[PDB]
Amino acid sequence: HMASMKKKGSVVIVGRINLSGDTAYAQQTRGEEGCQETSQTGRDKNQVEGEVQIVSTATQTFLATSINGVLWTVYHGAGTRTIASPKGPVTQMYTNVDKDLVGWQAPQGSRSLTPCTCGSSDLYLVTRHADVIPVRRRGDSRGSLLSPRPISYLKGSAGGPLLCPAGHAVGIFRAAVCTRGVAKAVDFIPVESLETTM
Ligand SMILES: COc1cnc(O[C@@H]2C[C@H]3C(=O)N[C@]4(C(=O)NS(=O)(=O)C5CC5)C[C@H]4/C=C\CCCCC[C@H](NC(=O)OC(C)(C)C)C(=O)N3C2)c2cc(Cl)ccc12
Numbered sequence: 243h244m245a246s247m248k249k250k251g252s253v254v255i256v257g258r259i260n261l262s263g264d265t266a267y268a269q270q271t272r273g274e275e276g277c278q279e280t281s282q283t284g285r286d287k288n289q290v291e292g293e294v295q296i297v298s299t300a301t302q303t304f305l306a307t308s309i310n311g312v313l314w315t316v317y318h319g320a321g322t323r324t325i326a327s328p329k330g331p332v333t334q335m336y337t338n339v340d341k342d343l344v345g346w347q348a349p350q351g352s353r354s355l356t357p358c359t360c361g362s363s364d365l366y367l368v369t370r371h372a373d374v375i376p377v378r379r380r381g382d383s384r385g386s387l388l389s390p391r392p393i394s395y396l397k398g399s400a401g402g403p404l405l406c407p408a409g410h411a412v413g414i415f416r417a418a419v420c421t422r423g424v425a426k427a428v429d430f431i432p433v434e435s436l437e438t439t440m
């Protein structure tokens with residue numbers, strides 16, 4: 243019935259992938275119970291840092307990447323959900339189910355990657371475990387892993403970046419190309435598709 247209809251939670255930032263050292267590592271900034279509360283209220287008073295966020299809904303965890311002042315992630319992860327912020331829930335600024343892309347205004351304190359202009363096919367995929375994986379660009383939206391990995395390794399990383407050697411955002415990871423449970427390639431949303439969206 244209509245009087246007791248439930249709301250869907252906000253996406254919640256629960257950690258980050260630190261890329262600002264000589265070492266990449268994941269940091270958690272909020273645990274599960276805290277995440278649940280924040281998802282319902284939408285009020286997240288934590289201080290955000292960096293380019294790559296670890297984000298959660300009540301049922302899934304994945305990544306989000308800031309580019310040009312926008313925090314971007316995958317639709318199949320975020321749906322049309324708001325994101326928790328210091329002032330309450332923030333509505334998506336961009337939503338495109340066909341591209342599997344959503345975005346919100348980037349959090350105060352985050353930093354954005356610059357969209358890539360270098361034309362390079364030597365790419366680097368950043369996973370939720372802070373692995374930095376070399377990927378050879380193969381097309382507009384595809385790249386090959388130099389070393390194939392079981393998918394289990396890539397699961398939870400949709401929304402993360404593909405970076406060029408200069409650390410320029412090239413795209414947002416979206417899907418794994420798989421055979422017999424082995425990812426041999428990745429599908430991504432090119433940074434150029436985000437700029438058309440913007
Ligand atoms: C809303 O539009 C949409 C929804 N879903 C998907 O694709 C789904 C979700 C991804 C996914 O899990 N991403 C992931 C992911 O990690 N998602 S997530 O973070 O874990 C989830 C969001 C919380 C990058 C892949 C990671 C693990 C692989 C597990 C299953 C792989 C199957 C699969 N691959 C496949 O679809 O590839 C084709 C296009 C070549 C046919 C796949 O990766 N996905 C299947 C797509 C894919 C594409 Cl190309 C375009 C749109 C679109």
Ligand SMILES: [Zn+2]
Pocket residue numbers: 358359360361362406407408410
């Ligand atoms: Zn470049």
